[PDB]
mmCIF file of all heavy atoms in Angstrom:
data_model
loop_
_atom_site.group_PDB
_atom_site.id
_atom_site.type_symbol
_atom_site.label_atom_id
_atom_site.label_comp_id
_atom_site.label_asym_id
_atom_site.label_seq_id
_atom_site.Cartn_x
_atom_site.Cartn_y
_atom_site.Cartn_z
ATOM 1 N N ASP D 66 -26.880 5.362 -41.673
ATOM 2 C CA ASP D 66 -27.314 4.003 -41.440
ATOM 3 C C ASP D 66 -28.787 3.874 -41.063
ATOM 4 O O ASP D 66 -29.398 4.852 -40.464
ATOM 5 C CB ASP D 66 -26.384 3.290 -40.414
ATOM 6 C CG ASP D 66 -25.034 3.012 -41.065
ATOM 7 O OD1 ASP D 66 -24.932 3.041 -42.262
ATOM 8 O OD2 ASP D 66 -24.158 2.590 -40.260
ATOM 9 N N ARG D 67 -29.326 2.695 -41.379
ATOM 10 C CA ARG D 67 -30.714 2.430 -41.059
ATOM 11 C C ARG D 67 -30.794 1.122 -40.194
ATOM 12 O O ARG D 67 -29.983 0.266 -40.340
ATOM 13 C CB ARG D 67 -31.544 2.234 -42.348
ATOM 14 C CG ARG D 67 -31.729 3.468 -43.193
ATOM 15 C CD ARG D 67 -32.370 3.073 -44.515
ATOM 16 N NE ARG D 67 -31.632 3.748 -45.636
ATOM 17 C CZ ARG D 67 -31.832 4.927 -45.972
ATOM 18 N NH1 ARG D 67 -32.673 5.708 -45.434
ATOM 19 N NH2 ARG D 67 -31.153 5.406 -46.997
ATOM 20 N N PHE D 68 -31.896 1.081 -39.409
ATOM 21 C CA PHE D 68 -32.254 -0.147 -38.666
ATOM 22 C C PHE D 68 -33.720 -0.323 -38.871
ATOM 23 O O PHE D 68 -34.505 0.566 -38.747
ATOM 24 C CB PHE D 68 -31.934 -0.042 -37.222
ATOM 25 C CG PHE D 68 -32.484 -1.220 -36.339
ATOM 26 C CD1 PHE D 68 -31.952 -2.477 -36.496
ATOM 27 C CD2 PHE D 68 -33.508 -0.904 -35.432
ATOM 28 C CE1 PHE D 68 -32.480 -3.500 -35.718
ATOM 29 C CE2 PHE D 68 -34.031 -1.978 -34.676
ATOM 30 C CZ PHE D 68 -33.498 -3.240 -34.935
ATOM 31 N N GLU D 69 -34.116 -1.599 -39.059
ATOM 32 C CA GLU D 69 -35.483 -1.909 -39.207
ATOM 33 C C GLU D 69 -36.020 -3.042 -38.326
ATOM 34 O O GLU D 69 -35.264 -3.873 -38.009
ATOM 35 C CB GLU D 69 -35.809 -2.355 -40.696
ATOM 36 C CG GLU D 69 -35.353 -1.471 -41.761
ATOM 37 C CD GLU D 69 -35.798 -1.998 -43.071
ATOM 38 O OE1 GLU D 69 -36.334 -3.085 -43.005
ATOM 39 O OE2 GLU D 69 -35.497 -1.350 -44.118
ATOM 40 N N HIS D 70 -37.326 -2.917 -37.982
ATOM 41 C CA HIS D 70 -37.948 -3.943 -37.092
ATOM 42 C C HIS D 70 -39.378 -4.109 -37.471
ATOM 43 O O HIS D 70 -40.012 -3.137 -37.760
ATOM 44 C CB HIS D 70 -37.780 -3.643 -35.652
ATOM 45 C CG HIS D 70 -38.323 -4.763 -34.819
ATOM 46 N ND1 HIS D 70 -37.744 -5.931 -34.551
ATOM 47 C CD2 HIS D 70 -39.428 -4.705 -34.035
ATOM 48 C CE1 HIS D 70 -38.459 -6.696 -33.820
ATOM 49 N NE2 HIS D 70 -39.504 -5.924 -33.417
ATOM 50 N N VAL D 71 -39.871 -5.325 -37.671
ATOM 51 C CA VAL D 71 -41.264 -5.533 -37.921
ATOM 52 C C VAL D 71 -41.981 -5.800 -36.657
ATOM 53 O O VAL D 71 -41.687 -6.700 -35.857
ATOM 54 C CB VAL D 71 -41.425 -6.816 -38.869
ATOM 55 C CG1 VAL D 71 -42.929 -6.945 -39.270
ATOM 56 C CG2 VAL D 71 -40.615 -6.732 -40.110
ATOM 57 N N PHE D 72 -42.973 -4.873 -36.428
ATOM 58 C CA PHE D 72 -43.825 -4.978 -35.191
ATOM 59 C C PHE D 72 -45.029 -5.769 -35.507
ATOM 60 O O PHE D 72 -45.976 -5.292 -36.100
ATOM 61 C CB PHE D 72 -44.196 -3.583 -34.647
ATOM 62 C CG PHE D 72 -43.006 -2.866 -34.046
ATOM 63 C CD1 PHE D 72 -42.159 -2.136 -34.823
ATOM 64 C CD2 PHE D 72 -42.803 -2.960 -32.636
ATOM 65 C CE1 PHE D 72 -41.066 -1.454 -34.211
ATOM 66 C CE2 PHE D 72 -41.841 -2.281 -32.038
ATOM 67 C CZ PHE D 72 -40.849 -1.574 -32.842
ATOM 68 N N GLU D 73 -45.036 -6.996 -35.006
ATOM 69 C CA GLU D 73 -46.128 -7.963 -35.256
ATOM 70 C C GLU D 73 -47.230 -7.950 -34.133
ATOM 71 O O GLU D 73 -48.317 -8.559 -34.412
ATOM 72 C CB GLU D 73 -45.560 -9.427 -35.438
ATOM 73 C CG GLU D 73 -46.158 -10.153 -36.620
ATOM 74 C CD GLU D 73 -45.548 -9.681 -37.991
ATOM 75 O OE1 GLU D 73 -44.301 -9.903 -38.033
ATOM 76 O OE2 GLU D 73 -46.199 -9.186 -38.813
ATOM 77 N N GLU D 74 -46.947 -7.390 -33.001
ATOM 78 C CA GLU D 74 -47.906 -7.421 -31.943
ATOM 79 C C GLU D 74 -48.307 -6.031 -31.418
ATOM 80 O O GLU D 74 -47.503 -5.144 -31.338
ATOM 81 C CB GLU D 74 -47.235 -8.212 -30.780
ATOM 82 C CG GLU D 74 -46.514 -9.504 -31.118
ATOM 83 C CD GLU D 74 -47.500 -10.553 -31.783
ATOM 84 O OE1 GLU D 74 -48.665 -10.473 -31.460
ATOM 85 O OE2 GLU D 74 -46.954 -11.397 -32.487
ATOM 86 N N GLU D 75 -49.631 -5.914 -31.117
ATOM 87 C CA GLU D 75 -50.149 -4.643 -30.589
ATOM 88 C C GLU D 75 -49.486 -4.274 -29.252
ATOM 89 O O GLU D 75 -49.013 -5.158 -28.504
ATOM 90 C CB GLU D 75 -51.651 -4.770 -30.476
ATOM 91 C CG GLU D 75 -52.219 -3.866 -29.387
ATOM 92 C CD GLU D 75 -53.734 -3.586 -29.625
ATOM 93 O OE1 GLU D 75 -54.458 -4.510 -29.994
ATOM 94 O OE2 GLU D 75 -54.175 -2.396 -29.383
ATOM 95 N N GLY D 76 -49.346 -2.996 -28.989
ATOM 96 C CA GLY D 76 -48.859 -2.579 -27.702
ATOM 97 C C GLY D 76 -48.032 -1.282 -27.751
ATOM 98 O O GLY D 76 -47.929 -0.676 -28.926
ATOM 99 N N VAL D 77 -47.419 -0.853 -26.647
ATOM 100 C CA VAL D 77 -46.609 0.308 -26.617
ATOM 101 C C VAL D 77 -45.167 -0.134 -26.347
ATOM 102 O O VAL D 77 -44.903 -0.802 -25.332
ATOM 103 C CB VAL D 77 -47.130 1.259 -25.484
ATOM 104 C CG1 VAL D 77 -46.150 2.454 -25.414
ATOM 105 C CG2 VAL D 77 -48.473 1.741 -25.804
ATOM 106 N N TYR D 78 -44.218 0.179 -27.222
ATOM 107 C CA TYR D 78 -42.884 -0.263 -27.101
ATOM 108 C C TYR D 78 -41.891 0.882 -27.004
ATOM 109 O O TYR D 78 -41.700 1.636 -27.955
ATOM 110 C CB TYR D 78 -42.561 -1.137 -28.298
ATOM 111 C CG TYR D 78 -43.439 -2.361 -28.419
ATOM 112 C CD1 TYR D 78 -44.582 -2.226 -29.246
ATOM 113 C CD2 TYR D 78 -43.210 -3.433 -27.723
ATOM 114 C CE1 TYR D 78 -45.437 -3.269 -29.301
ATOM 115 C CE2 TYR D 78 -44.102 -4.560 -27.759
ATOM 116 C CZ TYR D 78 -45.185 -4.414 -28.624
ATOM 117 O OH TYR D 78 -46.043 -5.536 -28.641
ATOM 118 N N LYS D 79 -41.281 1.044 -25.794
ATOM 119 C CA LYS D 79 -40.301 2.088 -25.663
ATOM 120 C C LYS D 79 -38.950 1.650 -26.117
ATOM 121 O O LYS D 79 -38.692 0.447 -26.257
ATOM 122 C CB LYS D 79 -40.205 2.514 -24.168
ATOM 123 C CG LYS D 79 -41.498 3.136 -23.590
ATOM 124 C CD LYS D 79 -41.293 3.665 -22.137
ATOM 125 C CE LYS D 79 -42.657 3.942 -21.452
ATOM 126 N NZ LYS D 79 -43.447 4.929 -22.103
ATOM 127 N N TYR D 80 -38.046 2.614 -26.487
ATOM 128 C CA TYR D 80 -36.701 2.255 -26.832
ATOM 129 C C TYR D 80 -35.809 3.386 -26.433
ATOM 130 O O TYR D 80 -36.271 4.554 -26.269
ATOM 131 C CB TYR D 80 -36.621 1.909 -28.294
ATOM 132 C CG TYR D 80 -36.990 3.119 -29.201
ATOM 133 C CD1 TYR D 80 -35.994 3.978 -29.596
ATOM 134 C CD2 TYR D 80 -38.292 3.409 -29.629
ATOM 135 C CE1 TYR D 80 -36.300 5.043 -30.411
ATOM 136 C CE2 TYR D 80 -38.561 4.437 -30.396
ATOM 137 C CZ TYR D 80 -37.564 5.319 -30.775
ATOM 138 O OH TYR D 80 -37.858 6.380 -31.565
ATOM 139 N N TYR D 81 -34.524 3.096 -26.264
ATOM 140 C CA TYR D 81 -33.543 4.103 -26.208
ATOM 141 C C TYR D 81 -32.316 3.819 -26.984
ATOM 142 O O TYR D 81 -32.333 3.008 -27.937
ATOM 143 C CB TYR D 81 -33.175 4.502 -24.807
ATOM 144 C CG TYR D 81 -32.462 3.480 -23.847
ATOM 145 C CD1 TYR D 81 -31.568 2.527 -24.327
ATOM 146 C CD2 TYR D 81 -32.477 3.651 -22.449
ATOM 147 C CE1 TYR D 81 -30.828 1.648 -23.465
ATOM 148 C CE2 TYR D 81 -31.753 2.837 -21.669
ATOM 149 C CZ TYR D 81 -30.961 1.818 -22.156
ATOM 150 O OH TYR D 81 -30.239 0.982 -21.340
ATOM 151 N N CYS D 82 -31.312 4.536 -26.745
ATOM 152 C CA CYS D 82 -30.006 4.314 -27.340
ATOM 153 C C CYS D 82 -28.971 4.098 -26.352
ATOM 154 O O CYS D 82 -28.895 4.815 -25.271
ATOM 155 C CB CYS D 82 -29.608 5.638 -28.174
ATOM 156 S SG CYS D 82 -27.911 5.635 -28.834
ATOM 157 N N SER D 83 -28.184 2.989 -26.446
ATOM 158 C CA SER D 83 -27.187 2.647 -25.381
ATOM 159 C C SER D 83 -26.122 3.666 -25.242
ATOM 160 O O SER D 83 -25.507 3.792 -24.175
ATOM 161 C CB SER D 83 -26.634 1.214 -25.688
ATOM 162 O OG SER D 83 -25.688 1.278 -26.610
ATOM 163 N N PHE D 84 -25.844 4.450 -26.287
ATOM 164 C CA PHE D 84 -24.837 5.474 -26.189
ATOM 165 C C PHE D 84 -25.396 6.752 -25.536
ATOM 166 O O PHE D 84 -24.679 7.464 -24.884
ATOM 167 C CB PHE D 84 -24.339 5.921 -27.577
ATOM 168 C CG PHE D 84 -23.751 4.739 -28.371
ATOM 169 C CD1 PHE D 84 -23.815 4.803 -29.790
ATOM 170 C CD2 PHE D 84 -23.138 3.693 -27.737
ATOM 171 C CE1 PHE D 84 -23.245 3.779 -30.558
ATOM 172 C CE2 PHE D 84 -22.568 2.673 -28.574
ATOM 173 C CZ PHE D 84 -22.687 2.704 -29.897
ATOM 174 N N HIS D 85 -26.670 6.929 -25.600
ATOM 175 C CA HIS D 85 -27.376 8.150 -25.072
ATOM 176 C C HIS D 85 -28.684 7.702 -24.483
ATOM 177 O O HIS D 85 -29.740 7.900 -25.008
ATOM 178 C CB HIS D 85 -27.681 9.207 -26.119
ATOM 179 C CG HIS D 85 -26.524 9.413 -27.044
ATOM 180 N ND1 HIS D 85 -26.406 8.977 -28.311
ATOM 181 C CD2 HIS D 85 -25.353 10.185 -26.787
ATOM 182 C CE1 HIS D 85 -25.206 9.351 -28.810
ATOM 183 N NE2 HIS D 85 -24.593 10.035 -27.911
ATOM 184 N N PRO D 86 -28.658 7.084 -23.183
ATOM 185 C CA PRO D 86 -29.807 6.495 -22.552
ATOM 186 C C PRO D 86 -31.000 7.456 -22.310
ATOM 187 O O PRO D 86 -32.098 6.998 -22.297
ATOM 188 C CB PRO D 86 -29.338 5.872 -21.365
ATOM 189 C CG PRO D 86 -27.884 5.541 -21.687
ATOM 190 C CD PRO D 86 -27.451 6.705 -22.573
ATOM 191 N N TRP D 87 -30.702 8.694 -22.125
ATOM 192 C CA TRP D 87 -31.736 9.704 -21.882
ATOM 193 C C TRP D 87 -32.676 9.944 -23.072
ATOM 194 O O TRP D 87 -33.725 10.445 -23.000
ATOM 195 C CB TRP D 87 -31.224 10.985 -21.365
ATOM 196 C CG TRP D 87 -30.388 11.737 -22.438
ATOM 197 C CD1 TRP D 87 -30.801 12.623 -23.392
ATOM 198 C CD2 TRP D 87 -28.978 11.523 -22.683
ATOM 199 N NE1 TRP D 87 -29.816 13.020 -24.144
ATOM 200 C CE2 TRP D 87 -28.671 12.405 -23.749
ATOM 201 C CE3 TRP D 87 -27.960 10.802 -22.100
ATOM 202 C CZ2 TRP D 87 -27.303 12.398 -24.274
ATOM 203 C CZ3 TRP D 87 -26.690 10.826 -22.552
ATOM 204 C CH2 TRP D 87 -26.364 11.723 -23.660
ATOM 205 N N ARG D 88 -32.165 9.511 -24.287
ATOM 206 C CA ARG D 88 -33.048 9.692 -25.511
ATOM 207 C C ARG D 88 -33.914 8.444 -25.609
ATOM 208 O O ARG D 88 -33.528 7.417 -26.125
ATOM 209 C CB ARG D 88 -32.142 9.867 -26.697
ATOM 210 C CG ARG D 88 -31.309 11.129 -26.701
ATOM 211 C CD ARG D 88 -32.194 12.412 -26.655
ATOM 212 N NE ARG D 88 -31.350 13.561 -27.139
ATOM 213 C CZ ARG D 88 -31.918 14.779 -27.208
ATOM 214 N NH1 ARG D 88 -33.086 15.087 -26.783
ATOM 215 N NH2 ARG D 88 -31.124 15.775 -27.729
ATOM 216 N N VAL D 89 -35.162 8.660 -25.274
ATOM 217 C CA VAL D 89 -36.235 7.675 -25.173
ATOM 218 C C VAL D 89 -37.325 7.929 -26.109
ATOM 219 O O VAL D 89 -37.885 9.056 -26.172
ATOM 220 C CB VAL D 89 -36.730 7.445 -23.733
ATOM 221 C CG1 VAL D 89 -35.607 7.021 -22.830
ATOM 222 C CG2 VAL D 89 -37.368 8.760 -23.245
ATOM 223 N N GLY D 90 -37.695 6.953 -26.932
ATOM 224 C CA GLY D 90 -38.862 7.165 -27.866
ATOM 225 C C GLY D 90 -39.844 6.008 -27.654
ATOM 226 O O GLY D 90 -39.619 5.070 -26.919
ATOM 227 N N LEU D 91 -40.970 6.094 -28.430
ATOM 228 C CA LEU D 91 -41.976 5.086 -28.382
ATOM 229 C C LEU D 91 -42.463 4.656 -29.749
ATOM 230 O O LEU D 91 -42.457 5.486 -30.716
ATOM 231 C CB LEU D 91 -43.231 5.461 -27.605
ATOM 232 C CG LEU D 91 -42.991 6.091 -26.204
ATOM 233 C CD1 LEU D 91 -42.816 7.538 -26.265
ATOM 234 C CD2 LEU D 91 -44.232 5.767 -25.324
ATOM 235 N N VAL D 92 -42.831 3.415 -29.906
ATOM 236 C CA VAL D 92 -43.589 2.928 -31.004
ATOM 237 C C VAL D 92 -44.867 2.360 -30.479
ATOM 238 O O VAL D 92 -44.857 1.514 -29.621
ATOM 239 C CB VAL D 92 -42.818 1.822 -31.869
ATOM 240 C CG1 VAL D 92 -43.689 1.371 -33.030
ATOM 241 C CG2 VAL D 92 -41.520 2.372 -32.373
ATOM 242 N N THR D 93 -46.033 2.897 -30.993
ATOM 243 C CA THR D 93 -47.352 2.445 -30.498
ATOM 244 C C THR D 93 -48.062 1.680 -31.590
ATOM 245 O O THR D 93 -48.347 2.212 -32.659
ATOM 246 C CB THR D 93 -48.142 3.618 -30.055
ATOM 247 O OG1 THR D 93 -47.473 4.308 -28.956
ATOM 248 C CG2 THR D 93 -49.530 3.170 -29.554
ATOM 249 N N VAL D 94 -48.280 0.391 -31.411
ATOM 250 C CA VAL D 94 -48.899 -0.478 -32.368
ATOM 251 C C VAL D 94 -50.256 -0.825 -32.087
ATOM 252 O O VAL D 94 -50.625 -1.341 -30.941
ATOM 253 C CB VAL D 94 -47.993 -1.811 -32.433
ATOM 254 C CG1 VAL D 94 -48.470 -2.646 -33.622
ATOM 255 C CG2 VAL D 94 -46.497 -1.503 -32.549
ATOM 256 N N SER D 95 -51.133 -0.565 -33.037
ATOM 257 C CA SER D 95 -52.549 -0.767 -32.923
ATOM 258 C C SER D 95 -53.039 -1.859 -33.823
ATOM 259 O O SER D 95 -52.669 -2.010 -34.969
ATOM 260 C CB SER D 95 -53.358 0.549 -33.154
ATOM 261 O OG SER D 95 -53.064 1.485 -32.165
#
Side-chain angles (χ1 to χ4, degrees):
Chain D
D66 283 348
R67 292 173 229 277
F68 170 69
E69 307 183 356
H70 182 72
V71 186
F72 286 86
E73 225 79 61
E74 315 299 334
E75 153 157 39
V77 177
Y78 304 92
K79 296 185 199 296
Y80 64 90
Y81 66 29
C82 170
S83 77
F84 302 150
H85 313 104
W87 65 91
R88 294 301 200 181
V89 298
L91 311 87
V92 179
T93 299
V94 189
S95 295

